[PDB]
């Protein structure tokens, strides 16, 4: 049982603060490194900051949503020149979306 | 868990047979381990240390005998073992040389000069 549990993944980092049981803890990844969860955190935070700096009359939730592929297929249907799910034919997605919808309009 | 089925785990490791494939050996195992369970002789980790040294002299090694003392240090620094005498006496008894009279050489006492 102990040798069965003993085969656990252990960090190859060894501490410089502790020589008494150094299993590491890590050097704790920066905001520059981690970028799909801290990216969402930063996106939510700057969105809320801008909404405060206007007052609360801007209102863009969701740092992403719906997905990536869904929006691309939506825009693919915009180039047919007919209806889609976001037109009838961060929050900076709209600036990205306008020039790629205006091709099909 | 109980010690008796743990003996059968040993029996699965050493034999190619499973524990369910043999019961003649497990009979003998129940004969030997029972009534000689729980130490009945005087313990000494020191004599075991000097006899693992004495065995490494028989392999014509003096470097590995003083590295063994550092492993003996590390053994105590972790301190999770209950009988450090027993497992090292056990590995020393099962030692095989890679390549007379010794009952007049120092051993552990029987505790039949002492109430148990």
């Amino acid at each position: 049982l102990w040798e069965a549990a003993l085969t656990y993944e252990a960090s190859k980092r060894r501490c410089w603060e502790r020589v008494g049981c150094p299993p590491g803890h890590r050097e704790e990844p920066y905001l520059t490194e981690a970028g799909r969860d801290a990216f969402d955190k930063f996106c939510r935070l700057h969105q809320g900051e801008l909404q405060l700096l206007a007052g609360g009359v801007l209102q863009a939730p969701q740092p992403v949503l719906v997905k990536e592929c869904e929006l691309v297929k939506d825009v693919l249907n915009v180039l047919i020149g007919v209806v889609s799910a976001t037109f009838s034919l961060p929050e900076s997605i709209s600036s990205l979306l306008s020039e790629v919808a205006e091709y099909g309009t | 868990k109980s010690p008796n089925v743990l003996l059968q785990n040993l029996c699965c490791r050493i034999l190619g047979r499973s524990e369910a494939d043999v019961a003649q050996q497990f009979q003998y195992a129940v004969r030997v381990i029972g009534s000689n369970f729980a130490p009945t002789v005087e313990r000494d980790e020191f004599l075991v240390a000097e006899k693992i040294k004495k065995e490494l002299i028989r392999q014509r090694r003096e470097a590995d005998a003083a590295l063994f003392s550092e492993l003996h240090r590390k053994l105590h620094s972790q301190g999770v073992l209950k009988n450090k005498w027993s497992i090292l006496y056990l590995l020393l008894s099962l030692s095989e040389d890679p390549r007379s009279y010794a009952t007049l050489f120092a051993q552990a006492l029987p505790r039949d000069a002492h109430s148990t």
């Binding site: 102990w2 040798e3 549990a5 003993l6 656990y8 252990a10 049981c21 299993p23 803890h25 | 010690p3 743990l6 003996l7 785990n9 040993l10 029996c11 490791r13 050493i14 034999l15 190619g16 047979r17 050996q25 003998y28 195992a29 030997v32 381990i33 000689n36 369970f37 729980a38 130490p39 009945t40 002789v41 693992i52 065995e55 490494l56 590995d64 063994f68 492993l71 590390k74 053994l75 972790q78 999770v80 073992l81 209950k82 009988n83 027993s86 497992i87 090292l88 006496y89 056990l90 590995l91 020393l92 008894s93 099962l94 030692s95 095989e96 040389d97 890679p98």
Partner: protein, 65 residues
Amino acid sequence: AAAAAANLNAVRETMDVLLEISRILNTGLDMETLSICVRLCEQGINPEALSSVIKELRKATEALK
């Protein structure tokens, strides 16, 4: 936890020290048998009693060979 994985590191440390002593003497035991023998020796057992068994079970696999 975290401090419960440090103890799971401190048992691998011991097991490596015992694994070193098992090879510099060139015993018959392998690492898997040895993990049963550590459990037996933790309870308090005569090491004179187990070794006679192990001396017979290794000749009982020459009664298998």
